[PDB]
Amino acid sequence: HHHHHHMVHITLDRNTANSWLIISKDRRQVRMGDTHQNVSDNKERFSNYPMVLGAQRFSSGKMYWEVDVTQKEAWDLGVCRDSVQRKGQFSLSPENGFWTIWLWQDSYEAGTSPQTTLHIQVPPCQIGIFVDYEAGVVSFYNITDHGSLIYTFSECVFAGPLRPFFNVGFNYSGGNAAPLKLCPL
Ligand SMILES: CCC(=O)Nc1nc(C)cs1
Numbered sequence: 001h002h003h004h005h006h007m008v009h010i011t012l013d014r015n016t017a018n019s020w021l022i023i024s025k026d027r028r029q030v031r032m033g034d035t036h037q038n039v040s041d042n043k044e045r046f047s048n049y050p051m052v053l054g055a056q057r058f059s060s061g062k063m064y065w066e067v068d069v070t071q072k073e074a075w076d077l078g079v080c081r082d083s084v085q086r087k088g089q090f091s092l093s094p095e096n097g098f099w100t101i102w103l104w105q106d107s108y109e110a111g112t113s114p115q116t117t118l119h120i121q122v123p124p125c126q127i128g129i130f131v132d133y134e135a136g137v138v139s140f141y142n143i144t145d146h147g148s149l150i151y152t153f154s155e156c157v158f159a160g161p162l163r164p165f166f167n168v169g170f171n172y173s174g175g176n177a178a179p180l181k182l183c184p185l
């Protein structure tokens with residue numbers, strides 16, 4: 001792909017984070033803590049899952065960023081509407097305002113309803129995410145495999161401003177403590 005020139009500097013929004021997440025000083029890394037991180041509750045925080053939003057809101061144009069997923073066993077990445085549900089249980093689907101892929105139990109899937117199997121020969125250490133607001137496109141790229149395409153959501157109905165979306169995943173196994181990191185431009 002040749003989307004690199006639409007690169008945007010994403011930072012994480014502390015106020016949206018699940019209360020167990022630890023966001024770095026530079027707001028570019030997030031990991032699961034082993035306990036509640038001693039923050040007050042608010043209506044923005046994802047309550048049920050280890051999720052956080054980027055601070056940036058996008059309503060037009062083309063945007064590209066990269067995320068490091070090295071040594072994680074489970075995670076979700078993509079974009080979502082600014083008005084997604086924060087409290088209780090929900091599925092990741094375009095009907096609910098999410099355009100995402102994930103790793104779970106040694107398989108990669110796109111968050112369609114129902115979910116779609118992805119075909120990845122080279123397990124990615126870094127994922128590229130491309131959004132074309134006007135075209136209604138969200139695409140995912142395998143940076144470890146020379147930028148190969150992972151998945152394209154097309155005919156997207158965003159229906160609002162978009163925010164970068166992250167889930168570091170639970171760490172029941174002791175094998176998923178590693179952070180998600182926003183990679184430099
Ligand atoms: C990826 C295409 C898409 O956005 N489909 C949607 N389904 C509904 C029903 C809302 S958005």
